[PDB]
Structure formats: structure tokens, C-alpha cells
Structure 1
Amino acid sequence: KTHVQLSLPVLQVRDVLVRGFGDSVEEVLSEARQHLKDGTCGLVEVEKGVLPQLEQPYVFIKRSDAAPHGHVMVELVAELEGIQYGRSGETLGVLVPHVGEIPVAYRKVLLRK
């Protein structure tokens, strides 16, 4: 399928143990997509002070359209040293590995895969 319904655990930035997906834009997009397929991806909501506490390159989920079955349609955009790879809508959050941190909420998304 071109899209997959996922329910992503929303993590507090100070709880995150693994603060990024790797070392290059292509690696972090690759790993993000693998962890989304494996159910081992979390979401951190972006506010003042969050991104400097995580590791670049960043992987964002961004709204791809204006929400089937309560799932916002999203796609991935990476960022390294202020350059984004992809073009999309509003940021829903930054993706990180999930390694068993307790979430504060779940974010239902339809991921363009």
C-alpha cells in the first residue's frame, strides 16, 4: 500500500534514550522508515528547546494534505545544518527510535510509504 495507518507514541524529549536515527540524511530517512514499519518509532512534539536536545540529521513528519479515519496524512522530511530534503506541510513532530519510553499520548497518522 502507498499509505499505512500508524499510531505513534508521543515521547517527552527528556525521556528519549536514542536521540536520532543516524549520521546522514539518507540514513536517517532509511532508519525512520524501517522503525515506522517495525512499530519502533516515536514522535516528539517540536517546541522551543526541543531540537537542540536531539541529534541531527532530524526526521520530521509533515502534513501532506488537508484526515482519513482520524489519521492525518504525513510524509517524511529530513533536515541537516538548516537544509531540508523534501518539501511538505506543517510539522507534527520529530521522529526518534522508540526503545520502551512511556508515551504521553498517541498520534494517529497515515504515512506516505
Structure 2
Amino acid sequence: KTHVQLSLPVLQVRDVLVRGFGDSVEEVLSEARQHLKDGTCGLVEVEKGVLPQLEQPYVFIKRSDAAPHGHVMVELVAELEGIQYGRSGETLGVLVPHVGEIPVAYRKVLLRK
């Protein structure tokens, strides 16, 4: 399937134990896609002071369209030193590994895979 229905656990930035997916744009997109598939991917909602507490490169989920079955359609865009690889809509948040942090919420998305 080109799209997969996922419910992403929303984590508070100060709870996150693994603050990025790796060391290159290509690696963080690869790792992010693998974690999304394995159900080991969390979402941190971007606000003032969040991104400096996470590790670059960043992986964003961005709204790709205006929401089947409650699931917002999203795609992955990476960022390294102010340059983004991909072009999409509004940021829903920044992806991180999920290693057992208690979420504050769930974000239903339809991921272009």
C-alpha cells in the first residue's frame, strides 16, 4: 500500500530519551521510515524551544493534503542546518524514536510510504 494508517504517540520533548534518528538526511529518513513501519516512532509537537532540545538532522511529518477515517495524510521532510529535503504542507511535529516514554496523546496520520 502507498499509504499506511498509523497512530503516533505524542511525547513531551523533555521525556524523549533518543532525540534523533541518526547523522545524515538520508539516514534519519531511512530510520524514521523503519520506526514508523515497526510502530516504534513518536511525535513531538513543535513549539518555541523544542527543536534546539532535539538532534539534527530533524525528520518532520507535514500535511500532504486537505483526512480519511480521521487520519491526516502526511509525508516526511528532513532538515539539516536550515535546509529541508522535501517540500510539503504544515508541520504536524518532529519524529523521534519511541523507546517506552508515556505519551500525552495520539496523532492519527495516513503516511505516504
TM-score band (shorter)?
over 0.9
Shift of 1:32: 0.1
CA distance in 2: counterparts of 1:2 and 1:66, whole angstroms: 17
Q: Deviations over 1:82-109 (max 9, x none)?
A: 0000000000000000000000000000
Residues 21-61 of structure 1: per-residue CA shift (max 9 Å, x gap): 00000000000000000000000000000000000000000
Q: What's the offset of the Cα at 1:112?
A: 0.2
The CA distance in 2 between the partners of 1:108 and 1:36, in whole Å, is: 12
TM-score normalized with structure 2 length: 1.00
- 1:81-100 paired onto structure 2 within 5 Å: 81-100=81-100
Q: For the aligned residues, what is the CA RMSD?
A: 0.1
Q: Secondary structure at the match of 2:76?
A: strand
The Cα of 1:20 is off from its aligned counterpart by 0.1
Match of 2:31 in 1: 31
Q: For 1:56 and 1:30, how far apart are their aligned partners in 2?
A: 14
Measured after TM superposition, the shift of residue 79 of structure 1 is 0.1
CA distance, structure 2, for counterparts of residue 89 and residue 24 of structure 1: 23
Percent same amino acid among aligned pairs? Answer: 100
Unaligned runs of 5+ in 2: none
- Give the equivalent residue in structure 1 for 2:40: 40
1:3 aligns with 2:18: no
Equivalent position SS for 2:101? coil
- State TM-score, norm by structure 1: 1.00
CA distance in 2, matches of 1:26, 1:64: 20
Structure 1 Cα separation of the partners of residues 37 and 5 of structure 2: 10
Runs of at least 5 residues in structure 1 that lack an aligned partner in the other structure:
none
Distance (whole Å) between structure 1 residues aligned to residue 46 and residue 37 of structure 2: 23
Moved over 6 A (4+): none
Distance of 1:79 and 1:31 partners within structure 2: 14
Task: Give me the whole-angstrom Cα distance separating, in 2, the residues matched to 1:52 and 1:110.
Answer: 27
